[PDB]
Amino acid sequence: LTEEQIAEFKEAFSLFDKDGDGTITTKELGTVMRSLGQNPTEAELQDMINEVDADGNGTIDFPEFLTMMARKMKDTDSEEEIREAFRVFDKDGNGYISAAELRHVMTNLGEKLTDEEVDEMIREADIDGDGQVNYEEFVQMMTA
Ligand SMILES: COc1ccc(S(=O)(=O)N(CCO)c2ccccc2CN(C)C/C=C/c2ccc(Cl)cc2)cc1
Ligand SMILES: COc1ccc(S(=O)(=O)N(CCO)c2ccccc2CN(C)C/C=C/c2ccc(Cl)cc2)cc1
Ligand SMILES: COc1ccc(S(=O)(=O)N(CCO)c2ccccc2CN(C)C/C=C\c2ccc(Cl)cc2)cc1
Ligand SMILES: [Ca+2]
Ligand SMILES: [Ca+2]
Ligand SMILES: [Ca+2]
Ligand SMILES: [Ca+2]
Numbered sequence: 001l002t003e004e005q006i007a008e009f010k011e012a013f014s015l016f017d018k019d020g021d022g023t024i025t026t027k028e029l030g031t032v033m034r035s036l037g038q039n040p041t042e043a044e045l046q047d048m049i050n051e052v053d054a055d056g057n058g059t060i061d062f063p064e065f066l067t068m069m070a071r072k073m074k075d076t077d078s079e080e081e082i083r084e085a086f087r088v089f090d091k092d093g094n095g096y097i098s099a100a101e102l103r104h105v106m107t108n109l110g111e112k113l114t115d116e117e118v119d120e121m122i123r124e125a126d127i128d129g130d131g132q133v134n135y136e137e138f139v140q141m142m143t144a
Contacts (some may be wrong), residue, residue: 009066009069010062012065013062015109015110016029016032016060018031018032018110022062023059023060023061024049024065026042026045026046029045029049029060032109035109035110036085036088036105036108036109046058052064073144076142076143082138082142082143083135085138088105089102089105089133091104095134097122097133098122099118099122099131102118106118
């Protein structure tokens with residue numbers, strides 16, 4: 001790990017952990033998933049948590065959250081899950097995620113960000129330098 005990978009991962013954790021109590025619950029997981037256009041059942045939420053629930057307390061703490069990261073880094077999400085994620089961001093469907101589109105998704109996740117901060121995330125993911133994120137750039141981002 002790097003210092004900035006840890007900081008990246010802690011912020012990712014704090015968006016699932018809505019009440020900042022240190023554990024992600026099925027209710028918090030369900031709330032995030034609905035804000036990203038998904039609709040898991042209560043049992044699917046339990047299945048997701050149980051796949052990385054090391055100590056069997058039914059919630060996900062930061063270490064378990066990291067281990068999930070390293071897992072989907074080894075075996076990536078399926079193509080269709082990555083395609084679905086892209087569609088969540090690319091709301092006009094034109095093939096490119098803009099800063100405005102990234103901003104709209106962050107507002108649904110309850111993430112406060114300046115405009116420059118949104119622009120920074122776009123620039124980091126952009127490869128060809130057109131200032132937008134196409135599917136290929138998105139796939140590369142999501143697969144480590
Ligand atoms: C920058 O803004 C964002 C917004 C959302 C995420 S996203 O991580 O929700 N995402 C990653 C795609 O794979 C995602 C993106 C779009 C649509 C749906 C998802 C959820 N996917 C299935 C994985 C959810 C499985 C899962 C299980 C348990 C836990 Cl604890 C956490 C996640 C990331 C960054
Ligand atoms: C390869 O292309 C990429 C890869 C990673 C990201 S990055 O936005 O994660 N990033 C991690 C540095 O800290 C980052 C990178 C460059 C500039 C700004 C950031 C955002 N950071 C400061 C706060 C992180 C807020 C945040 C929210 C939601 C989630 Cl799910 C995760 C993190 C962007 C594009
Ligand atoms: C399967 O379980 C999960 C759970 C959580 C996630 S995760 O996606 O939240 N995640 C953690 C965050 O660090 C992540 C993991 C691996 C690779 C990339 C990310 C998110 N990257 C930092 C870019 C996020 C910023 C960004 C910028 C530019 C654009 Cl255009 C869109 C988004 C994924 C899968
Ligand atoms: Ca919590
Ligand atoms: Ca646990
Ligand atoms: Ca678009
Ligand atoms: Ca681009």
